[PDB]
């Protein structure tokens, strides 16, 4: 039910450190986007930093004055590019087997957490749009 | 629980494992990458175990006071990660527990928060991030437990017992020097009593 | 144990199976036992007895 | 075939069948659906009478405030049942369980239609008496 | 993408398969008419190549079925690779083991997006459908 | 190993591997299949120790003022097997287990019109325990595992020392979490301090 | 004496027996049903023996005060069951004993009662009905007595002796927490002395 791969925090205009609760295999798999009037994606080394493996430090504080109410931390694991590919000559290793298993789990888990990209039931009995517009509704009757 | 063996080895972690291996007389390994070395793999597991245990005890350098934990805006949940070795209140009796991997207010019987909570938290750090004296104590305690479990030499047990006590003593000296604690003016209660 | 080159016409596309005949392989029939087919690359498929 | 299914609640019944395959009992989640949603605990509120059925210690119904019960499979993504350790014998059982566990998560990944709006016969978006927020 | 449709009134049988599939039973072919018709493989369509399906009969908009849907439904219960002790561990088998779960995950990325999804502007793109039964 | 990964490992498998490591055995990669006696024995001792330490009673796990609602028809409150401790909020306790149901010994009745309010300890998972408590559970489970399934006496003395230290750090956690004060936090002395 | 072998096996009783079996290193049994397992049968016998013994000691949770035992209207006999682990008077010196399986008033030298008698009684309860701490003590004491009689390992003896002492201590902590006894206002004598 509750999404574990997409974490979004309120932006107060003075806090620049945000926690990463979910696992990830590469820092590029973590996507930092500021939500507000628009959804602005941030750059790995110019807009933020990995202060620790569980903490993202923004270079600049963002807030409602900047037009961004929330910041979102989302894991996007590569589906076409696998981190481990076995060869007919390679020594089988525990690390390679772990990464292959974990990468498929993240892809499966990210698929199971797609209520973020649709209208799904939140903790309460309410369908959640999660701070974006329902565009192209057009006429109503 | 954080995976100790899934990241690149640091020079200090390589040094620590070889020190643990030396405790029972195993020769040093060049890398922590999988070479089917059961002894080195066992040493790393005990190294991680002791690293978590000594950090969770609590020290001025690793106890973070006044830390804000932010909730998810749409779920109102604050995650209680397994890397939170200790999570307390800033003052008085603590009210937050772990329930299903999220922070739970036991007094209000709620896991929903509209805003961040301020807690006294110990978060797991890398062995590389430990002070030098604390690294020595972790290795000494890991070496002692490693010998007890996988060799059991009683002569090695006695010496590492004395080494750990000395290693813990020097960590206590570090913690007092780092803390700079005063019972007159650094005291929460007595400093108010000193005003004339 | 026998080495068998699979002949033409054994593969059926509507089932996507290459079915080999045991009496064709051995010149003989069998009653009981698991059957293992070993490919040169190391792929093993095991057939339980009907 | 469905990893999530719901049974209507009456005070007479206490046994509910589990159709799906679960690797661990903690992967099965039992929730009471009414005006309020309540997750039940493994032993105080129910039990596993057999592998494929769950028996509640208490009978529930409209008087208690819950008209339906939901039996959902939630395989753990963070806590993997298999972790390969260096210097350990590579067993085919470990490889199969690692493949099944990630498959179960992906199997539940294609059952989010229940937790979504859904589409009508007319082709509209049917919010089943649910407010849309944010 | 795991779902694609072709509408061909003229005499044509061949439809290129965009998605990768592990087994022929995973590709399911339906006819989207007044009511959907699920077609068996041997009677209705042959795999002329791994990339293309040659659906027997025109099945054009002359019939009600008009467009043809190529859907990938990977079986969760059935695993194309089952590791057995005593068998050579093949890099192919290890690689395809992850792929089957990933394909199921890919199919899930489209089933949820089907009813309502998010467009490239980061907004939920409705298909022009009223939100009925909505509660205030 | 490439990449700056951040991945977790299941704590129960880590706890079991710590128990097998205590007696010098290689770790297992998995805990299911029901064909491994070591997995079955270590996991069973881990649950028993986890159950036993939680039942002792701590500020973080003693839930105060919890209401247990009876059945609407039978008016029976189930006395759960996972109720490690059930007491009254104040004074002498009056509720006992009688046939799996909460029984009021003073009034001699299993029937309750409304929910009762109790001081309850409900069993939690090993994952939900504080890190110091997890170490104590694992240390105590390892010590019990050696006494029952290894039997080496030099391991006993080692694990006896470790459990004593493990309990000490959990006792420090209880006081830091408790924040107990005998002047104003005290139930009786706080009234005596009013001028 | 109540039969321990003749009813359905419960999860706790099965868990208790496997705990007792583990004390000497025996593997767990799936069921308590008769499979010619002498060790499991021996463990269940000691489990029942220890269960009766600790309950008979007397605790606030299991001592029933003011219970009325009713006689048979046509025989005027009150049965003194073997499941009455203790039978006392509510106050002062006790006057009832067991004579031929029936309650006997030793002061009046009669076993005939025209109406119910009020007694402080301990009645045998299932091991399920015991509090979690008391279940652990019963298992720990049964495990110690099982090893003493059927294996006799001296190393196991020493550890189980320490475990029983800890188990009994935690049952004593439960006794006072459950009891909530006060010497000022909860005292039979002092509370009267506190009135001004």
Swiss-Prot record, chain A:
Query: Where is it located?
Result: Virion
User: Which domain of life, per UniProt?
Assistant: Viruses
Function, as annotated: Structural component of the short non-contractile tail. The tail comprises six fibers made of gp17 trimers, 2 nm in diameter and 32 nm in length. May attach to host lipopolysaccharides (LPS) to mediate primary attachment to the host cell.
| Subunit-level organization | Homotrimer. Interacts with tail components gp11 and gp12.
Hey, which family's this protein in? Belongs to the Teseptimavirus fiber family.
Write the protein's name.
Answer: Tail fiber protein
Q: Which organism is it from?
A: Escherichia phage T7 (Bacteriophage T7)
Which stretch of the intact protein is present?
3 to 143 of 553
Curated annotation (Swiss-Prot), chain C:
Q: Which cysteines are joined by disulfide bonds?
A: none
Cellular compartments annotated: Virion
Coiled-coil regions listed:
none
Per the record, the domain of life is Viruses
Q: How does it assemble?
A: Interacts with head-to-tail connector protein gp8, the tail component gp11, and the fiber protein gp17.
Its job: Structural component of the short non-contractile tail. The tail complex is involved in viral genome delivery. Forms the end of the tail, including the canonical tube, the nozzle, and the small extensions below the fibers. Once the tail tubular structure is formed, the interface between gp11 and gp12 generates the proper environment to interact with the six gp17 trimers.
**Name the record gives this protein:** Tail tubular protein gp12
Shown residues in whole-protein numbering: 597 to 646 of 794
From Swiss-Prot, chain D:
Q: Localized where?
A: Virion
Question: How is this protein organized at the quaternary level?
Answer: Homotrimer. Interacts with tail components gp11 and gp12.
Q: What does this protein do?
A: Structural component of the short non-contractile tail. The tail comprises six fibers made of gp17 trimers, 2 nm in diameter and 32 nm in length. May attach to host lipopolysaccharides (LPS) to mediate primary attachment to the host cell.
Q: Which family does it belong to?
A: Belongs to the Teseptimavirus fiber family.
Question: What is the protein name for this chain?
Answer: Tail fiber protein
Q: Which organism is it from?
A: Escherichia phage T7
UniProtKB/Swiss-Prot annotation, chain F:
What InterPro entries does the annotation carry?
A: Tail_Gp11
The protein's UniProt keywords, in alphabetical order, are: Viral genome ejection through host cell envelope, Viral penetration into host cytoplasm, Viral short tail ejection system, Viral tail protein, Viral tail tube protein, Virion, Virus entry into host cell
Q: Does the record carry Mitochondrion as a key word?
A: no
Quaternary data: Interacts with head-to-tail connector protein gp8, the tail component gp12, and the fiber protein gp17.
Q: Does the keyword section mention Transferase?
A: no
Purpose of the protein: Structural component of the short non-contractile tail. The tail complex is involved in viral genome delivery. Forms the 12-fold symmetric toroidal domain immediately below the connector protein gp8. Once the tail tubular structure is formed, the interface between gp11 and gp12 generates the proper environment to interact with the six fibers, each made of gp17 trimers.
| Coiled coil ranges | none
Protein's GO biological process: symbiont genome ejection through host cell envelope, short tail mechanism
Q: Which Gene Ontology cellular component terms are annotated? A: virus tail, tube
What is this protein's record name?
A: Tail tubular protein gp11
Q: Which family does it belong to?
A: Belongs to the tail tubular protein gp11 family.
Where does it live in the cell? Virion
**Pfam families the record matches:** Tube (PF17212)
Source species, domain of life = Viruses
The scientific name of the source species is Escherichia phage T7
């Amino acid at each position: 039910n509750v999404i574990k791969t997409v974490l979004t925090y309120q932006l107060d205009g003075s806090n620049r450190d945000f926690n990463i609760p979910f696992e990830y295999l590469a820092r590029k798999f973590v996507v930092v986007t500021l939500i507000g009037v628009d959804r602005k994606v941030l750059t790995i080394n110019t807009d933020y930093r990995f202060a620790t493996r569980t903490t993202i430090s923004l270079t600049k504080a963002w807030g409602p004055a900047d037009g961004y109410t929330t910041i979102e931390l989302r894991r996007v694991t590569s589906t076409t590019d696998r981190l481990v590919d076995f060869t007919d000559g390679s020594i089988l290793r525990a690390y390679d087997l772990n990464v292959a298993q974990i990468q498929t789990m993240h892809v499966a888990e990210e698929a199971r957490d797609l209520t973020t990209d649709t209208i799904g039931v939140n903790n309460d009995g309410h369908l959640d749009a999660r701070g974006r517009r329902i565009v192209n509704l057009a006429n109503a009757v | 629980m954080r995976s100790y063996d899934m990241n690149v080895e640091t020079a200090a972690e390589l040094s620590a494992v070889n020190d643990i291996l030396a405790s029972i007389g195993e020769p040093p390994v060049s890398t922590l990458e999988g070479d089917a070395n059961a002894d080195a793999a066992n040493a790393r597991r005990i190294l991680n175990k002791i690293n978590r245990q000594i950090q969770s005890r609590g020290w001025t350098f690793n106890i973070e006071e006044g830390i804000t934990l932010l909730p998810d805006v749409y779920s109102n949940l604050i995650v209680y990660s397994d890397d939170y070795l200790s999570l307390m209140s800033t003052s008085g009796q603590s009210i937050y527990v772990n329930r299903g991997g999220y922070v739970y207010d036991r007094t209000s019987q709620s896991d929903r928060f509209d805003s961040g909570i301020t807690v006294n938290i110990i978060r797991l750090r890398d062995y590389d991030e430990m002070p030098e004296c604390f690294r020595y104590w972790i290795v000494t305690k890991a070496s002692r437990q490693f010998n007890n479990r996988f060799f059991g030499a009683p002569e090695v047990e006695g010496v590492l017992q004395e080494e750990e006590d000395e290693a813990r003593r020097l960590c206590m000296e570090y913690e007092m020097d780092y803390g700079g604690y005063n019972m007159l003016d650094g005291d929460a209660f007595t400093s108010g009593l000193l005003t004339r | 144990k026998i080495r068998y080159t699979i002949p033409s016409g054994t593969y059926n596309d509507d089932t996507f199976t290459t079915s080999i005949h045991i009496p064709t392989i051995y010149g003989a029939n069998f009653g009981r036992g698991k059957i293992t087919v070993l490919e040169p690359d190391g792929k093993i498929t095991v057939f339980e007895q009907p």
